[model samples]
Target: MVLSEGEWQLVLHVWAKVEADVAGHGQDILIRLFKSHPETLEKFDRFKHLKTEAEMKASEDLKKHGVTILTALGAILKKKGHHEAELKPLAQSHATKHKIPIKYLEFISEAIIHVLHSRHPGNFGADAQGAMNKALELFRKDIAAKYKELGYQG
Candidate 1:
């Protein structure tokens, strides 16, 4: 509930760089997710079958899903990190409709950290990293509460 003004600014500051190429960066984040937690990738019918680097790179399906992920992120950023209302339907869909575990959200958060750090540690910086972490931490709690309300447990 408290992402703070400065923290929100920092997140948006670094977001421009990521936003410049959402498809590439988004796909990169997903690639990181699939590699770090292969089990999550198995749930993706369109992408679980892709077995090689070249295959994943050549696949448009992966980018579409990646864009979907980034679009959600874009929505969050659009709200300046005051994301409770924005995240509600997303939580509902991901929980009841998508049927994904809570780990998936945390995993993406981690993947985003890695992606940002990997892409530009100096630019992203500690403050920016902390800001992003705090925002996503809030996101996690919000979604968890929503899931719990819907009779789903993490």
Candidate 2:
């Protein structure tokens, strides 16, 4: 959608609020985003009415694997001693899943970081950035795995 910085910030703010409640929050955020930028909805099916039973079922299915990687990310981060190294594979895998370059994923992360820095400066430090890197890494891996599970290859 060629999101402006302000729009990017808003998106990240909404995203942060729903990170833990991804299925629910994702639906809501997509609705809001679609309403604000209706043209973007062309990118996906069920862009509207995502609270339907069908959508909930799909979300639950996706969350099954997503939660696993998210839960394991902490241990991986500790073992690696750095976020970027552990998460590079994750970013790559996510790009592979969506057929987009890792660069776009990185841009998404940067936008979120900018929002977090602005909203909660005190909590947005190097350590927080490290944590975020770990999370994004896990996000990429989970997305890739989901695509594979769904029999999509690219």
Candidate 3:
């Protein structure tokens, strides 16, 4: 169980709002991740030159890629506890296509939690916060570990 059945239930309720605006919400996640960890931008050739906040937000690539990340999260939550297996192919895709360091997963994971907390202040509080943390952190670890195995060897 991902922190009990009830917490997963808690997370799924909050996720309904996110699914409605994956592009916008996921875009914010990337932007926040970039601002706090600008070094991440160095890997993505598409938005490497984005310096200003508006610049990052306006990039079409950023918006779509952000959607992609959130979509991945949406997929994982659909199954609940079988998250680790789901990430293997996803990590492969991201490692090969995105070419970002596996460590970057944590930045995205943390950003998702922060975005959820900020976006749904009343709903995603306290236990829901920890629920998300457990979920997203599993996401980060599985993807990162696989990336390390594949990318590092290549």
What is residue 116's positional error in candidate 3, in angstroms?
A: 1.4
- Candidate 2 per-residue lDDT over residues 76-142, each given as its tens digit: 4333333445555554554454354434444544554555555556655665655565555555555
User: Relative to the true structure, how large is the alpha-carbon lDDT of every model?
Assistant: 0.84, 0.47, 0.81
Which residues of candidate 2, in runs, are more than 4 Å off? 1-106
Task: Please give the lDDT score at residue 122 for candidate 1.
Answer: 77
What are the clash counts of all predictions, listed in order? Answer: 0, 0, 0
Kindly indicate the candidate among 2 and 3 with the higher lDDT. 3
lDDT value for model 3: 0.81
Which 10-residue span in candidate 2 carries the lowest summed lDDT? Answer: 1-10
TM-score of each: 0.93, 0.36, 0.86
Error of 2 at 64 (Å): 25
Model 1 lDDT tens row, 1-154: 7878899888888888888998999889988888888888887776889887678878898988788889887788768656778888887887777788988888989999999999978778888999999888877887898899888884
Q: Model 3 — TM-score against the truth?
A: 0.86
Pairs clashing within candidate 1: none
* Model 3 misplaced regions, further than 4 Å: 96-99, 148-154
- The local lDDT score (0 to 100) that residue 136 gets in candidate 3 is 72
